[PDB]
Amino acid sequence: ENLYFQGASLTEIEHLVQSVCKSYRETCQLRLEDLLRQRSNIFSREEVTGYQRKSMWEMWERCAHHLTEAIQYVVEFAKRLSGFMELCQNDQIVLLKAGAMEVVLVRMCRAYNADNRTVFFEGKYGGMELFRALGCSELISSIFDFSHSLSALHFSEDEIALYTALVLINAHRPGLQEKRKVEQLQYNLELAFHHHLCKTHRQSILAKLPPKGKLRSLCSQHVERLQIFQHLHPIVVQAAFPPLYKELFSG
Amino acid sequence: KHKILHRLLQDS
Numbered sequence: 001e002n003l004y005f006q007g008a009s010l011t012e013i014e015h016l017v018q019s020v021c022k023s024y025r026e027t028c029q030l031r032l033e034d035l036l037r038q039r040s041n042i043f044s045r046e047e048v049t050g051y052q053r054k055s056m057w058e059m060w061e062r063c064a065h066h067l068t069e070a071i072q073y074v075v076e077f078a079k080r081l082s083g084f085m086e087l088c089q090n091d092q093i094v095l096l097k098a099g100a101m102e103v104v105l106v107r108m109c110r111a112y113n114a115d116n117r118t119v120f121f122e123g124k125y126g127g128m129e130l131f132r133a134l135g136c137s138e139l140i141s142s143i144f145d146f147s148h149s150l151s152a153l154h155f156s157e158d159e160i161a162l163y164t165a166l167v168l169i170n171a172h173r174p175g176l177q178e179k180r181k182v183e184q185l186q187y188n189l190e191l192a193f194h195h196h197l198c199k200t201h202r203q204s205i206l207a208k209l210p211p212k213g214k215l216r217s218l219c220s221q222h223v224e225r226l227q228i229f230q231h232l233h234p235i236v237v238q239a240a241f242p243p244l245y246k247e248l249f250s251g
Numbered sequence: 252k253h254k255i256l257h258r259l260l261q262d263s
C-alpha cells in the first residue's frame with residue numbers, strides 16, 4: 001500500500017525527510033518568523049488583570065477553542081504525512097486521538113519565549129499568570145516547564161517536523177489493528193529523523209529529548225482537569241465546547 | 252461516534 005510500510009533505502013529515507021518537512025511547512029499554522037517578531041508585543045498589567053477577572057468557564061472555552069484550531073492543523077499534517085492515509089480509518093483515528101494533543105504541545109515551544117517565560121495567546125505574549133482563572137495551575141505550570149525544556153534544545157523547523165511526525169506515528173498506541181504497518185512506518189520515520197540529525201551534526205539532542213511518558217502525563221492531566229471542569233460546568237461543555245474537542249477529550 | 256474526525260479524514 002506504501003513504500004514506507006517495508007524496508008527503505010538511504011535515498012528513500014532522504015526523500016522521506018524532504019516529504020515530512022514539506023508536510024509540516026504547509027500545516028505549521030503560525031509562521032515562526034511572525035512568532036519571533038511578536039516577542040516584543042507583551043500583554044500589559046491591565047490586560048493580564050482582565051484575563052484573571054474572566055470567569056473560569058469563559059477562559060476554559062477560549063482555551064478549548066484555540067487548542068481545537070491547533071488540532072485541525074495537526075489533522076492536516078497527519079493527512080499529508082507519507083503513509084498515514086494508507087493506514088485504515090480505525091488506526092488513523094487511534095493515532096490522532098492519542099497523538100494530536102501531544103503534537104500541539106510540541107508545536108507550542110515555537111510560540112513560547114524562554115527569555116521571559118511567556119507564551120503567544122490571542123495576539124500577544126503572556127506569562128502563566130494570564131491563565132490563573134482556569135483553576136489548573138499545576139497543568140499550566142507543567143505545560144510551561146515542558147515548553148521551557150523544549151526551547152533549551154533550540155529546535156529547527158525541520159527537527160520539529162520530523163520529531164512531531166514520530167510523536168504521531170507511534171506503533172505502541174493501544175487499539176491499533178495494523179500494528180506491524182505502523183511499526184514499519186515509525187521505523188522509517190525514526191531513520192529519517194536520525195539521518196537529518198546525523199547530517200546536521202545534531203545527534204547530541206537525542207539524549208536531551210523528553211521521555212515518552214512526559215507527553216502522556218501532560219495529556220492525562222489535561223483529560224483529568226477537563227473532567228473536574230465538566231462536573232462544575234456541564235452545560236458549558238455540552239453547549240459551548242468545540243465538537244472536535246469533546247470527541248477527542250470527553251468521549 | 253468520531254463524527255467530526257471521520258469527516259475531516261474523508262474531506263479531500
Ligand SMILES: COc1ccc([C@@H](NC(=O)C2=CCC(=O)N=C2)C(=O)Nc2ccc(C(C)C)cc2)cc1
Pocket residue numbers: 028029030063065066067069070107108111119120121122123131140143
Ligand atoms: C501552532 O502553535 C500554536 C497555535 C496556537 C497558539 C495560540 N493561538 C491563540 O491564542 C488563538 C487566538 C485566537 C484564535 O482565533 N485562535 C488561536 C494559542 O492557542 N495559545 C495558547 C497558549 C497556551 C495555552 C495553554 C497554556 C492554556 C493555550 C493556548 C499558539 C501556538
Ligand code: NA
Pocket residue numbers: 109110111112113114147151
Ligand atoms: Na521557544
